[PDB]
Design a protein around this ligand. Structure first.
Ligand SMILES: NC(=O)c1ccc[n+]([C@@H]2O[C@H](COP(=O)([O-])OP(=O)(O)OC[C@H]3O[C@@H](n4cnc5c(N)ncnc54)[C@H](O)[C@@H]3O)[C@@H](O)[C@H]2O)c1
Ligand SMILES: NC(=O)c1ccc[n+]([C@@H]2O[C@H](COP(=O)([O-])OP(=O)(O)OC[C@H]3O[C@@H](n4cnc5c(N)ncnc54)[C@H](O)[C@@H]3O)[C@@H](O)[C@H]2O)c1
Lengths: 373, 375
């Protein structure tokens, strides 16, 4: 089979500065280029890498016009808008170094250059994220942040921070989405003797997995939220989840409940989360995802607190780019590139989001006209 | 029929809840709420004096302990029952810990005081709370949460800066020093995380059945275990053989870049040695909730010590065992222990007893001859 020749690859990755020189395990950076440069160049392909992706006349905007393959990463996402896709005359393959391709306008991608392939490294960092969810649940429930601040400030007042400290044992935790991440969140929660583990997804777990993990499907989202002490969002960003967690839906959660979001920032309405915290309807919010990214320096969820001055466990978008995760998604990007560059187009079907002008996944909403290859 | 004891003076040393304990009645373990004991004691004709004033020369604790028959302490704000104080406690018969860990009592001195006083604690009351806090703290350290949250609140954004020290717990080896009620519950919570191995070191082992259920392996030598672990968690009591156990020499057997968690007692580590190991990068992190002494002095080195990247500190005040869920259980348990004494039945749960009738009543405070387990 004839290999494709002299393919222009454009990678939009985060700037690792001195960190990426000092810690070579930062593969997903403009410095280390996912370990791809020599492997591409030895085949006669070219690689252009940038972190400059947001401003008018950005390097991304110039280079995308003749890139055949565009590698993006959700931690520093080159937004492939309809406007940009219309200028990307050579684009055939959009590879996400990570999981979650919602920074691509997938409807526009299906109408671009005959229908481009949008692929991501399915399963590469799902464990990383599930760990981060459980961590964030415990940090919020146990009131870690203001307690650690009290220590670093030289203070000592056990009652001040114990007054909002709970145990996770005996609490009800619900996941929105029970795919690779949500299932792994419930598998890590099992050992904590929560009162119940609940999920909401139009793609259910098998009865065998329900019994093994010890969890229950709730058919209505609002009915699940009303039963939970903790809610974790683990679904992709698509038209029906954008702004899903607005004031009306957050009002269905219990007063004093804890919300975790390691999915996508735009699934919540940031002002509505900030207001719920401000009034004490939420005890806490945490996670690692923001809209847009980089998160603006004045984004309200950097500093929003509950009425006790706690309840914020936000971090930069990092869970999916742990050093352990990066080794796996760097390897997976190479595998997806090799499928295309070899001329075999022998993608893992689970890596495909859109392909040949159609959605190739069930996970971006309940659709007609999905073609699983 | 057994005659109840009469007009017993009870002294409780608890933390000051200030306005918090008025606003949140679930803060039972405070001078405000008195573990919900006051009416229950007073209706029997007993007296209760409660204080947070326990450290200064001529403290309320020092005055009242001289004729208290029962002294209730709490590890979060511990009235240290030193040999000097026990020698002045002329009426003391029962020392009850509101919580778990009675090392703030000189237990050797307690065995020689007033014919051997009973030292009891509420075994099992907050062991889940602590085990949760351990797993949380392990994850916070391994995933580099603290400096990442600080970056966000400061208005900054640099993924590489904090991802460069962010690992997954999957595939790491975790060891526990102690596999009693907390250590076993830590391993039960780690099971779902697909650690490479779960290890323990304890002279009281798990049953083979429990080892296979949880999926863990006993290591016979402590230094051997430390050299294999990426994460170590300390879950044993404070006694002569564990005081200063985690000194520079033992910490040097841990892997470079390892994470150390201590929710047991502060004095099990040598704080200057932990700070030095962190500062040179031998530890990537230290965290937990316990300090020596308590309250932790404002300048305690572990409030502010960091790894060379400016992270690696997940310290909190002594709080894990005093979650609102825990306080309900240890308040109820203190009442149960008090009722055993005040009823004249002395029908304590054997597992609640630390020393009793002049002898250690537990195997958990070191390997001893002259341990008398009741039953
Ligand atoms: N924070 C990070 O670093 C990080 C990294 C990986 C993935 N993610 C995000 O997490 C998402 C999920 O990852 P995954 O590996 O679990 O995906 P997955 O496709 O295995 O599972 C997602 C599940 O969400 C369900 N879903 C879709 N819409 C839903 C809705 N309205 N309500 C409930 N469930 C719904 C789907 O049916 C599916 O089962 C990704 O799409 C990405 O946005 C974040
Ligand atoms: N941070 C908190 O709020 C909090 C709350 C409760 C308990 N604690 C501390 O945790 C300790 C453990 O509580 P637990 O409920 O698990 O007690 P436990 O008695 O069930 O178990 C303690 C175990 O440690 C073992 N041990 C003793 N010396 C050891 C040594 N040198 N090496 C290894 N193992 C050793 C014992 O054999 C025993 O199995 C308490 O004594 C207390 O000091 C902390």
């Amino acid at each position: 089979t004839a290999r494709l020749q002299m393919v222009k690859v454009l990678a939009v990755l985060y700037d690792g500065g001195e960190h990426a020189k000092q810690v070579p395990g930062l593969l997903g950076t403009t410095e280390n280029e996912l370990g791809l440069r020599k492997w591409l160049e030895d085949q006669g392909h070219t690689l252009v890498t940038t972190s400059d992706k947001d401003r008018e006349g950005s390097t991304f905007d110039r280079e995308l016009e003749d890139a055949e393959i565009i590698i993006t990463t959700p931690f520093h996402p080159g937004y492939l808008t309809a406007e940009r896709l219309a200028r990307a005359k050579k684009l055939k393959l959009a590879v996400t170094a990570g999981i979650g391709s919602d920074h691509v306008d997938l409807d526009a991608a299906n109408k671009t250059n005959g229908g481009i392939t949008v692929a991501e490294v399915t399963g590469s960092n799902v464990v990383s994220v599930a760990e981060h969810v459980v961590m964030t649940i415990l940090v919020l429930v146990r009131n870690f942040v203001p307690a650690h601040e009290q220590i670093e400030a030289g203070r000592w007042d056990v009652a001040e921070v114990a007054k909002d400290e709970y145990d996770l044992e005996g609490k009800v935790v619900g996941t929105v989405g029970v795919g690779r991440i949500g299932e792994r969140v419930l598998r890590r929660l099992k050992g904590f003797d929560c009162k119940e583990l609940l999920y909401y997804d139009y793609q259910p777990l098998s009865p065998e997995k329900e019994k093994e993990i010890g969890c229950r499907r709730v058919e209505n989202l609002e009915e699940m939220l009303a039963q939970c002490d903790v809610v974790t969002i683990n679904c992709p960003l698509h038209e029906s989840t954008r702004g899903l967690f607005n004031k009306d839906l957050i009002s269905k959660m219990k007063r004093g409940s804890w919300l975790v979001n390691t999915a996508r920032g735009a699934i919540v309405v940031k002002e509505d989360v900030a207001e719920a915290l401000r009034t004490g309807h939420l005890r806490g919010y945490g996670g690692d995802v923001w809209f847009p990214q980089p998160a603006p320096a004045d984004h309200v969820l950097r500093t929003a607190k509950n009425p006790f001055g706690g309840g914020n466990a936000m971090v930069p978008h990092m869970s999916g780019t742990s050093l352990d995760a990066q080794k796996r998604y760097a390897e997976g990007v190479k595998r997806i590139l090799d499928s295309y560059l070899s001329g075999r187009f022998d993608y893992r079907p689970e890596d495909l989001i859109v392909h040949q002008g159609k959605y190739a996944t069930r996970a971006y909403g309940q659709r007609e006209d999905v073609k699983i290859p």
